[PDB]
Amino acid sequence: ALVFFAEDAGAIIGL
Amino acid sequence: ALVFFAEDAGAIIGL
Amino acid sequence: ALVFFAEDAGAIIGL
Amino acid sequence: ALVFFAEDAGAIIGL
Ligand code: MET
Ligand code: MET
Ligand code: MET
Ligand code: MET
């Protein structure tokens, strides 16, 4: 599984 | 919807 | 890239 | 945060 980051403030973190 | 970035090397883009 | 589904109603779709 | 499922075979879980 990869770590994905979005910005929305702070980081939205997808595992 | 958000733009997500991972890396694995280079970037991996998520929508 | 994988298609990810969550439920929140309808499907939240991650590309 | 949501629970996401993909498949690739078997399930791939995202948080
Ligand atoms: C697994 O790879 C997962 N963290 C991907 C982002 S959350 C759908
Ligand atoms: C929509 O925002 C999509 N790019 C990400 C859904 S959360 C896994
Ligand atoms: C790429 O694999 C992408 N669709 C994963 C879910 S959105 C972060
Ligand atoms: C939080 O909801 C996390 N499991 C998914 C973030 S959107 C890629």
Numbering used by the authors:
A (entry chain A), B (entry chain B), C (entry chain A), D (entry chain B): 1 to 15
Paper text:
Amyloid-β (Aβ) forms heterogeneous oligomers, which are implicated in the pathogenesis of Alzheimer’s disease (AD). These hairpins are similar in composition but differ in hairpin alignment, altering the facial arrangements of the side chains of the residues that they contain. Aβm17–36 and Aβm17–35 are cyclic hexadecapeptides consisting of two heptapeptide β-strands (Aβ17–23 and Aβ30–36 or Aβ29–35) connected by two δ-linked ornithine turn units that promote a β-hairpin-like conformation.
Aβm17–35 is designed to display the side chains of Met35, Gly33, Ile31, and Gly29 on the LFAD face and the side chains of Leu34, N-methyl-Ile32, and Ala30 on the VFE face. The X-ray crystallographic structure of Aβm17–35 contains two molecules of Aβm17–35 in the asymmetric unit. Both molecules fold to form twisted β-hairpins, and variation between the two monomers is minimal, consisting mainly of Met35 rotamers. The tetramers formed by Aβm17–35 consist of four β-hairpins arranged around a central axis to form a β-barrel. The tetramer can be viewed as a dimer of dimers in which two monomers assemble to form an antiparallel dimer, and two antiparallel dimers further assemble to form the tetramer. The side chains of Phe19 and Met35 lie at the center of the hydrophobic core and are buttressed by the side chains of Leu17, Ala21, and Ile31. The absence of a side chain at Gly33 facilitates the tight packing of these hydrophobic side chains in a fashion similar to that previously reported for a cylindrin comprising three β-hairpins from αB crystallin. The charged residues Glu22 and Asp23 sit on the solvent-exposed ends of the Aβm17–35 cylindrin away from the hydrophobic core. Intermolecular hydrogen bonds between the monomer subunits further stabilize the tetramer.
